Design a protein around this nucleic acid. Structure first.
Lengths: 85, 50
RNA sequence: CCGAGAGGUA
DNA sequence: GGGTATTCGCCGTGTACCTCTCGCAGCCC
DNA sequence: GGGCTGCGGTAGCGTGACGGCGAATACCC
């Protein structure tokens, strides 16, 4: 289970997070104070053998992965730790 | 005319992909690796030093 | 009064 | 190391005019 | 009511042109 990023559709982060909460996928998005601190970006945690990235990409409210190339970006665990503000 | 202050510098696509690349055979660096540096999936060194 | 699609004249 | 030789991927593909329709839905913010 | 925005989905859609030319690269020295 490694951490990925998802760019959601504009103004659908609540619905995307709701569907990914009905699946077993961890979501992470800082709330600033109530609007999110970041834009439509969202951090998911799963495993591509348990739930596949195509199923994540076809979720209601998820536009795409932050890819940078072929494979979607793994964000390191120091970043996910340092979003615990 | 007006202008937009692009908060990141941004490559002109005409001088990147005119076949041949002007940045490509200006830097002696292949067009694939320049597109991998520009689209944030690889790094290139500037002044490696010691 | 800009674009697209369909049809037609030479 | 560089010489053939194949593959990839960009270029291009007539002129003038006439008529008609149709041109954002979704939408969760 | 509204900003804006590229599909709508818990995937896959694509699928009937053809040539020329030059760079990128593969195979075999």
């Amino acid at each position: 289970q490694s951490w990925y990023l998802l760019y959601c559709k504009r103004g659908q982060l609540q619905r995307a997070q709701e569907h990914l909460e009905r699946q077993a996928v961890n979501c992470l998005a800082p709330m600033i104070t109530s609007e999110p601190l970041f834009p439509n970006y969202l951090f998911v945690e799963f495993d591509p053998e348990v739930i596949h990235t195509t199923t994540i990409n076809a979720t209601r409210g998820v536009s795409h992965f932050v890819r940078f190339g072929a494979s979607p970006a793994i964000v390191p665990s120091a970043v996910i730790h340092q979003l615990s503000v | 005319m007006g202008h937009i202050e692009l908060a990141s510098p941004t490559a002109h696509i005409w001088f990147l992909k005119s076949l041949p690349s002007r940045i490509g055979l200006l830097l002696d660096m292949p067009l694939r690796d320049i597109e991998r540096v520009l689209y944030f999936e690889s790094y290139v060194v500037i002044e490696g030093g010691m």
